[PDB]
A paper describes a structure:
T cell receptors (TCRs) are the adaptive immune system’s tool for recognizing and eliminating “non-self” intracellular antigens. After screening a host of computationally designed mutations in the Cα/Cβ context, we identify seven mutations that, when combined, significantly improve Cα/Cβ and full-length α/β TCR assembly and expression.
Adding all seven stabilizing mutations led to a seven-fold increase in expression and 20 °C increase in the Tm over the Cα/Cβ subunit harboring only the Cα166/Cβ173 disulfide (denoted “wild-type”). We obtained a 1.76 Å crystal structure of the stabilized Cα/Cβ subunit. In the crystal structure and the Rosetta model, phenylalanine 139 (Cα S139F) fills a partially buried cleft in the structure and forms tight packing interactions with the sidechain of Cα 129Q. Notably, the orientation of the interaction leaves the polar groups on the glutamine open for forming hydrogen bonds with water. The Rosetta energy calculations favor the proline because the residue has backbone torsion angles (ϕ = −73.4°, ψ = 52.3°) compatible with the closed ring of the proline. Isoleucine 150 (Cα T150I) packs tightly with surrounding residues and removal of the threonine does not leave any buried polar groups without a hydrogen-bond partner. Instead, the crystal structure shows the threonine adopting a different rotamer to form a hydrogen bond with the backbone on the other end of the loop’s turn (backbone nitrogen of Cα 193N). Rosetta modeled the arginine and aspartic acid to form a bidentate hydrogen bond, however the crystal structure shows that they form just one hydrogen bond so that the arginine can better pack with neighboring residues. Interestingly, the Cβ H139R mutation forms charge-charge interactions as well as a potential π-stacking interaction across the Cα/Cβ interface that may stabilize/lock-down the conformation of the Cα C-terminus, which also shows enhanced protection from HDX.
Author numbering:
A (entry chain A): 122 to 209
B (entry chain B): 118 to 246
The structure:
């Protein structure tokens, strides 16, 4: 089943840099493009783990702006109310 | 003249403990940034072998400055594996980006390195969360 979540992933070479991964949402969700040109948001990508007969959707967001967080990254999109935002 | 050509910087972002705990899966993300022209090939390498299963790479690079004509670009990719596979300290993960840029023939008088055709990579080793 879907398990929508926005996870924070840290750079393997500098722990203070990160990206935000919106993942495991159902295919009716529309990921909107960013309105700020300093914030980058990819299109939805469908990833297939053949080994587990498992498909999942994701989008990635990042920015150099200090006010960017995983909590506000996908604000321009309509996403599920049950989306999980783990404390970092 | 040719000074608008830039190779990518590449970084790997490690799976979050939260995802591992909640889903028993682990998503790595690779970002290639700051490149021009938008001509790259991104691949994932696990223990020295190229992988295609569990990979999704953006179909198109995005412009970092969409107003600019020769904006530099970015590209992302994800590789998703099992939590146990990521947590195994014997597994080495590498994101590889082939950039197609200048040749040896090209003149260059900029202070930065000559943005030639090249591969830029970033890496992470598996570990317990
Ligand atoms: Mg929010
Ligand atoms: Mg919203
Ligand atoms: Mg290798």
């Amino acid at each position: 089943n879907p398990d929508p979540a926005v996870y924070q992933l840290r750079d393997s070479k500098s722990s203070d840099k990160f990206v935000c991964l919106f993942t495991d949402f159902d295919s009716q969700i529309n990921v909107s493009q960013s309105k700020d040109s300093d914030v980058y948001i990819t299109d939805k990508c469908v990833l297939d783990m053949r080994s587990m007969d498992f498909k999942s959707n994701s989008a990635v967001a990042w920015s150099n702006k200090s006010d960017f967080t995983c909590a506000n990254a996908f604000n321009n999109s309509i996403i599920p109310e049950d989306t999980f935002f783990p404390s970092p | 003249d040719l000074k608008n050509v830039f190779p990518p910087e590449v970084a790997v972002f490690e799976p979050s403990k939260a995802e591992i705990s909640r889903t028993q899966k682990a998503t790595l993300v690779c970002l290639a940034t700051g490149f021009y022209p938008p001509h790259v090939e991104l691949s994932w390498w696990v223990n020295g072998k190229e992988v295609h299963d569990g990979v999704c790479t953006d179909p198109q690079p995005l412009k970092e400055q969409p107003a600019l004509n020769d904006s530099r670009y970015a590209l992302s990719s994800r590789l998703r594996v099992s939590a146990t596979f990521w947590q195994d300290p014997r597994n080495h993960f590498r994101c590889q980006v082939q950039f197609y840029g200048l040749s040896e023939n090209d003149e260059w008088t900029q202070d930065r390195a000559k943005p030639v055709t090249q591969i830029v990579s970033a890496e992470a080793w598996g570990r317990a969360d």
